[PDB]
Design a binder for these strands. Structure first.
Lengths: 225, 215
RNA sequence: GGUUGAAACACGACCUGAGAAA
């Protein structure tokens, strides 16, 4: 199956360097143009660079010319994006895209990778503190209860929150992270469950912040009052 | 001077079966080297239309593109529940390639009132010196809503953050969380902590409140 | 320039053209 796999992303200091890789499978990159397209968090796609199949000619967006270098290793079936003099404006999810075959898809990008997240900041990595959002209602209120976990003060994105080790997926709402004034991210993950489930069902929120290598499981229980 | 792609509208809410049209105007001649893409939240874009009007293999025939000089249109004949995403146009006539700003297509449904919940800060967090009061608005439509924090009838401003989810895949509703952040010294100087919510689906503002230590 | 060769430029072929057109 034709696929592109990006790698090499992560947290890097402004002015530092980072080399992104794009491993291709199911096809050979030597017969296609390979493009890099990025997407800052919450914005649109922005073309970055491309390399031509047979001449090796490279093209760059005006915002990255001179700082970025795209290349392809046909023996490794992998494209690269050498990024230097990185700025906060370069913080984005970086996709590598195959330009399709001319007769079959013109110049459209027919195959995209999953993308790799590049975060350019001088902020240090920080694991999140997880606090419980205890449900107010009782086990016999007869309604629907709401409980959650507060994932607070972490950097950088992303963090993952599951409930009962992924077994609880209905009614769960994991809000997007919001950047606080302190520069650390914070979000809440809530879930609505039947009030009759309190006691018969246990609720564990599983918070995984891979950049800081933090795994925290917090038990959300009805408050003792 | 490189080419610009002005995409309009930036967003639109439409129902299933509607006929939606997304337009892109190139600042200069791009011939027909225009492509249209569909991107689901958190996922990679997918090719829909290439060469302005040609349908990419595997894409259903309800998607169609057309060229009128420098005007390019993406048309979904009958909107399907899986067609709701962000759509981008791209010119590949000359380098540097440029994308349109995008158009997020969201499903329009009936108005739903938010279920409001208030959560006091856990005992563990004040031990850390910070208090976070969270107010939850669950499953409402439309997304617009007014969330106000009042402590001892005093309005708060500049110390709370809002976060809204994407449109839910099942009931097509939104959820909102408002988090009032205070220090322990500022949290204990007050008594009543109220969350006032105003939404068009409500006849009047709803208020969920609590007191420090009130169970 | 266009079309194509897994191919926007470079390269090969083809087409138009006085000339692929510095």
């Amino acid at each position: 199956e034709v696929q592109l796999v990006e790698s090499g992303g992560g947290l890097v200091q402004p002015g530092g360097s980072l080399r992104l890789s794009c491993a291709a499978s199911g096809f050979y990159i030597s017969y296609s143009s390979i493009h890099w397209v990025r997407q800052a968090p919450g914005k649109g796609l922005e073309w970055v660079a491309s390399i031509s199949p047979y001449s090796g000619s490279t093209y760059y967006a005006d915002s990255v010319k001179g700082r970025f270098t795209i290349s392809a290793d046909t023996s490794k079936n992998t494209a690269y994006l050498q990024m230097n003099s990185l700025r906060a404006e370069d913080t984005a999810v970086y996709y590598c895209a195959r330009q399709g075959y001319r007769r079959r898809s013109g110049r459209g990008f027919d195959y995209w990778g999953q993308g790799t997240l590049v975060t350019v900041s001088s902020a240090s990595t920080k694991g999140p503190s997880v606090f419980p959002l205890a449900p107010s209602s009782k086990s016999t209120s007869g309604g629907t209860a709401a409980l959650g976990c507060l994932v607070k003060d972490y950097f950088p994105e992303p963090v993952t929150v599951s409930w009962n080790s992924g077994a609880l997926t209905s009614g769960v709402h994991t809000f997007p992270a919001v950047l606080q004034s302190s520069g650390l991210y914070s979000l809440s993950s809530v879930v609505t469950v039947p009030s009759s489930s309190l006691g018969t069902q246990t609720y564990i929120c599983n918070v995984n912040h891979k950049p800081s290598n933090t795994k925290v499981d917090k038990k959300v229980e009805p408050k003792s009052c | 001077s490189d080419i610009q792609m002005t995409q309009s509208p930036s967003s639109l809410s439409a129902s299933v079966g509607d006929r939606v049209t997304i337009t892109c105007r190139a600042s200069q001649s791009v011939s027909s080297a225009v492509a249209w893409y569909q991107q689901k939240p958190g996922k990679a874009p997918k090719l829909l239309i290439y060469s302005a009007s040609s349908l990419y293999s595997g894409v259903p025939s309800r998607f169609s593109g057309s060229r009128s000089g420098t005007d390019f249109t993406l048309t979904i004949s009958s909107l399907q529940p899986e067609d709701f995403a962000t759509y981008y146009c791209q010119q590949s006539y000359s380098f540097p390639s440029t994308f349109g700003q995008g158009t997020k297509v969201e499903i329009k449904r009936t108005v739903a009132a938010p279920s409001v919940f208030i959560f006091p800060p856990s005992d563990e967090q004040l031990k850390s010196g910070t208090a976070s009061v969270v107010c939850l608005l669950n499953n409402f439509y439309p997304r617009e809503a007014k969330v106000q924090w009042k402590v001892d009838n005093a309005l708060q401003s500049g110390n709370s953050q809002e976060s809204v989810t994407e449109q839910d895949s099942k009931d097509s509703t939104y959820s909102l969380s408002s988090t009032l952040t205070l220090s322990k010294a500022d949290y204990e100087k007050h008594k009543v902590y109220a969350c006032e919510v105003t939404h068009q689906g409500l006849s009047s503002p709803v208020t969920k409140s609590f007191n420090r230590g009130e169970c």
